[PDB]
Write a protein of this length. Structure first.
Ligand SMILES: [Cl-]
Length: 188
C-alpha cells in the first residue's frame, strides 16, 4: 500500500492579519526575486520529512497522541526574518524564526524523537531551529535575498507595531501529515 511521506508539526493559524502582512512582505521580496511563491499552509516542524510503511501510519499516530497528550499550550514569538535553503541548496525559503518559545519546541521535539526511534525513523536535525516558512523558490537565491532585502523585510516586520499575531502566538495542537492524511491532537 506504499510508503508514505510523514511529517510532524505544530500548525500555525494563518489569521487575516498575518496573511495581510504577507501581502506586503511577499511583493517586497519579489522585487528582488520575482519567482518566490507563497506557502499554502504554515507550521513549525517537529520532525524531518520521512517515509513510513502504510501499515505503521495509524500505530505511529497513536504513539504520537499518547506522548503529546501531556503537553500544554504555550506562547511563542516569531518575528525575526530568516533566509535559508534546503540541504542541497536547490530551494530557498523566507521564514520567521522562533525566538521566545524555542525551548518549548525543543521539549516537544524530544518526545517526537522518541516516537521516531520507535518506528526506526530519523530523529530531528542536530542543530534545530523553528521557523514559519512564508515563501520559497527554486535555486539558491541567498545572494539576492540576504543583505538589503532581508534588512528591509525585517524593518517591515519591526514596524508591525508588536502585533500579537507574531509576538504572542498561542499553540493549540500537534499534527502529523502522512501522505494526504492529517492527524491532529490537542495540547492541554
Ligand atoms: Cl526570479
Amino acid at each position: 500500500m506504499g510508503n508514505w511521506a510523514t511529517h510532524v508539526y505544530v500548525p500555525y493559524e494563518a489569521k487575516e492579519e498575518f496573511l495581510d502582512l504577507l501581502d506586503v512582505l511577499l511583493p517586497h521580496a519579489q522585487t528582488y526575486v520575482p519567482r518566490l511563491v507563497r506557502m499554502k499552509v504554515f507550521h513549525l516542524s517537529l520532525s524531518q520529512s520521512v517515509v513510513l510503511r502504510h501499515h505503521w501510519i495509524l500505530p505511529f499516530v497513536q504513539a504520537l497522541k499518547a506522548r503529546m497528550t501531556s503537553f500544554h499550550r504555550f506562547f511563542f514569538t516569531a518575528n525575526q526574518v530568516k533566509i535559508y535553503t534546503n540541504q542541497e541548496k536547490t530551494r530557498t525559503f523566507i521564514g520567521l524564526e522562533v525566538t521566545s518559545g524555542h525551548a518549548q519546541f525543543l521539549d516537544l521535539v524530544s518526545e517526537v524523537d522518541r516516537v521516531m526511534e520507535e518506528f526506526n525513523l530519523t530523529t530531528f536535525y542536530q542543530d534545530p531551529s523553528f521557523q514559519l516558512s512564508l515563501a520559497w523558490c527554486v535555486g539558491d537565491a541567498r545572494l539576492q535575498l540576504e543583505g538589503q532585502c532581508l534588512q528591509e523585510l525585517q524593518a517591515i516586520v519591526d514596524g508591525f507595531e508588536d502585533a500579537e499575531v507574531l509576538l504572542r502566538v498561542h499553540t493549540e495542537q500537534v499534527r502529523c501529515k502522512s501522505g494526504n492524511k492529517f492527524f491532529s491532537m490537542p495540547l492541554k
